[PDB]
Design a protein around this ligand. Structure first.
Ligand SMILES: Nc1nc2c(ncn2[C@@H]2O[C@H](COP(=O)(O)OP(=O)(O)NP(=O)(O)O)[C@@H](O)[C@H]2O)c(=O)[nH]1
Ligand SMILES: [Cl-]
Ligand SMILES: [Mg+2]
Ligand SMILES: [Mg+2]
Length: 298
């Protein structure tokens, strides 16, 4: 453990001239990134060269757009330090304080407390989705088209070596993609990774902050409800998402649910594609195995 922290302490002090690191610890990890808590006050997100070459550049541009344009009391990262290169990216901002929302915490809240949290979420999403996004228009994301391009990459690489069961799962997904209408609705600026591990509560169990706008862009409005609708151990549950949708208003709930169900079906394929793009066999195997689990569940 000691070694990572030392290298990262060195890089921070090297790229940010007057910054002194008095303490540093690992606070989180993705597959190709690490986050550190520094001086018990700053979050530094860091990444070495990955397949997404403009990754922390976009995230920084989004925080800068949002800190200029959002009217909200909910806090989000405000970037004070940034170093962006092909081989290394670092973003630093003052840590937003609070407690991450979990299913367990939610279940100890009174009905009224739950309602106020749902209302806070709806209001935040309303305010973000209603922004004029002209000034961030470079951050457009077309999920259908992205899926079609990932399918082409499969066909060019490993598709012919898959099993019939794997091929059928993929083709059956592509048929559903082609018949659906859920990519044809309102587009807006979405957080696009809006799960409860990115939502911070204050001491009264009200929403106080939101982190990780790394995947944000102009995309289907239904995107920000994918995790709120999700039934799993990590998320609160379908009822929670449904109530938030009703409070948010002027959105077709059945379509939001169809969008979530399609994204969920895609997950194993998305996992396979990640493995191909990043040359990680482990992800290709995991996604293929998950196809079998889903096929045999019923
Ligand atoms: N309390 C607190 N924790 C934070 C804050 N920013 C980041 N974290 C912590 O650091 C973890 C990683 O941050 P996050 O932005 O989600 O990055 P990531 O998802 O690991 N990486 P990437 O966004 O590049 O895929 C979060 O799960 C959380 O533990 C913050 O402002 N406050
Ligand atoms: Cl494999
Ligand atoms: Mg995250
Ligand atoms: Mg992220």
């Amino acid at each position: 453990n000691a070694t990572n922290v030392k290298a990262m302490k060195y890089l921070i002090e090297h790229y940010f001239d007057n910054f002194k690191v008095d303490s540093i610890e690992i606070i989180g990890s993705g597959y190709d990134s690490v986050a550190y808590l520094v001086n018990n006050e700053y979050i530094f997100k860091t990444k070495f060269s990955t397949n997404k070459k403009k990754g922390y550049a976009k995230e920084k541009a989004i925080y800068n757009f949002l800190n200029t344009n959002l009217e909200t009391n909910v806090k989000i990262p405000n970037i004070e330090y940034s170093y962006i290169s092909d081989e290394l990216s670092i973003l630093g901002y003052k840590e937003i304080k609070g407690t991450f929302l979990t299913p367990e915490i939610y279940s100890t809240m009174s009905e009224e407390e739950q309602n106020l949290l749902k209302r806070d979420i709806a209001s935040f999403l309303r305010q973000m989705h209603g922004l004029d996004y002209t000034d961030i228009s470079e951050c457009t994301i077309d999920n259908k088209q992205n899926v079609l391009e990932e399918y082409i990459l499969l066909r060019e690489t490993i598709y012919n070596d898959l099993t019939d069961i794997e091929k059928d799962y993929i083709e059956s997904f592509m048929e559903r993609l082609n018949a659906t209408t859920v990519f044809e609705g309102k587009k807006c600026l979405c957080h696009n990774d809006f799960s409860c591990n990115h939502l911070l509560l204050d001491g009264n169990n009200r929403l106080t902050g939101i982190i990780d706008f790394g995947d944000s862009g102009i995309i289907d409005e239904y995107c920000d409800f994918i995790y709120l609708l999700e039934d799993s151990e990590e998320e609160i549950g379908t009822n929670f998402g449904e109530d938030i949708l009703r409070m948010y208003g002027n959105i077709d709930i059945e379509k939001a649910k169809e969008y979530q169900d399609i994204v969920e079906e895609y997950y194993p394929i998305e996992t396979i594609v990640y493995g191909i793009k990043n040359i990680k066999q482990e992800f290709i195997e995991n996604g293929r195995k998950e196809i079998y689990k889903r096929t045999y569940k019923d």
